[PDB]
């Protein structure tokens, strides 16, 4: 988290057919399911992977970045680690901080 660079996404409508890109059959079918008419998917006969041509009218999400004005917080001292208190790695990765 960097309050000076908040990551957001903006919906935009594709104005022009995009360049095709490769993807799994499973993923290509997922794109097709969402976009319907507005994406073509085609098996690549050799690889068995699929090409994914996002068409004009499709919706994209383009990352953009906000400057926020709360830059300061009361934070647990840098270096604090549940490990130094004796808590296992398995507990640390299971559990919310």
């Amino acid at each position: 988290y960097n309050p000076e660079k908040k990551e957001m996404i903006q919906e935009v409508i594709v104005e022009e057919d995009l360049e095709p890109f490769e993807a799994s059959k499973e993923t290509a079918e997922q794109f097709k399911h969402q976009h319907g008419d507005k994406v073509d998917i085609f098996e690549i006969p050799e690889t068995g992977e699929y090409s994914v041509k996002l068409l004009k009218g499709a919706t994209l999400y383009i990352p953009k970045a906000l400057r926020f004005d709360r830059l300061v917080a009361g934070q647990i001292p840098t270096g604090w680690n549940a490990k130094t208190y004796g808590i296992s790695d398995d507990i640390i990765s299971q559990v919310d901080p």
Partner: protein, 48 residues
């Protein structure tokens, strides 16, 4: 595809030999999904 009676209580050495008897050597749906995700999420743009 199929599984022994109590797979959770079978040691993984032994589970491997039961699957080996009916296994073609082909990757199957779960392995293929995870390798597609590895490449599409962890490889640089255009590295299919």
């Amino acid at each position: 595809g199929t599984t022994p009676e109590k797979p959770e209580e079978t040691p993984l050495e032994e589970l491997a030999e039961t699957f080996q008897d009916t296994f073609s050597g082909a990757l199957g749906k779960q392995s293929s999904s995870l390798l597609s995700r590895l490449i599409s999420s962890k490889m640089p743009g255009g590295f299919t």
